[PDB]
């Protein structure tokens, strides 16, 4: 959404003790921005973009 300014992605796994939090600013709703956010955290979860 355009209105929100702070965003969090919470990922819970059975093997992971404390759920992972991914932080997104206001201007990072772009798909490339989400990929970079999820990759840069280096939590073991890899995000990618596939053009069908």
């Amino acid at each position: 959404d355009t209105s929100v300014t702070s965003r969090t992605i919470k990922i819970e796994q059975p093997g992971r003790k404390e759920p992972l939090e991914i932080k997104l600013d206001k201007g990072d709703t772009s798909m490339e921005a989400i990929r970079d956010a999820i990759n840069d955290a280096d939590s073991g979860i890899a995000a990618s973009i596939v053009k069908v």
Binding site: D42, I49, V50, K51, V52
Partner: protein, 207 residues
Amino acid sequence: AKLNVNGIDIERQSNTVTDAPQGITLTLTKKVTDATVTVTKDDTKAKEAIKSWVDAYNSLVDTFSSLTKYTAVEPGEEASDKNGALLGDSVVRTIQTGIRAQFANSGSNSAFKTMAEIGITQDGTSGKLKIDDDKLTKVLKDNTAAARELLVGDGKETGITTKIATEVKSYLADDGIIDNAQDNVNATLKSLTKQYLSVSNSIDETV
């Protein structure tokens, strides 16, 4: 061309598929069933770049020390003995101080605040950099993002390498300590050449 990668259907116009997933180029030769492509991370390129950077720095420090090489004379007679060289010049002092100041990073988001954690440390007496391969390899394997954002950083104004490059470029480009040094010493050379011509004229007049 029609293929299927991890349950996603891909259709292309050629036998070189490149954007599924982005960053993998596949060359198709014949129809295949359930092939496996494994991509694993390698850190050889980064370690080679770091090693070459350290070697270049060590060579630079050797040259800098040679320009300051001095030989003490026990009785007190004065001779060349390579003692003079470039002693007392503020240029070498400024260059070394700037580089060593840049060794301490500013505004690094990573936990590491210096180059010791990555594994490059300097002997106190020698003042030259040396690395430990095992710790460096382990750090590259575990936290590559932290090392990248420490050394490369944002690539513009944050990180050890970019700050070193910025200050070195400032020195070399114009009015920088080494470039201003070259300009000022060239003006000094012109004045000294005029002085040598004047000395030749004085020799002619006296003789």
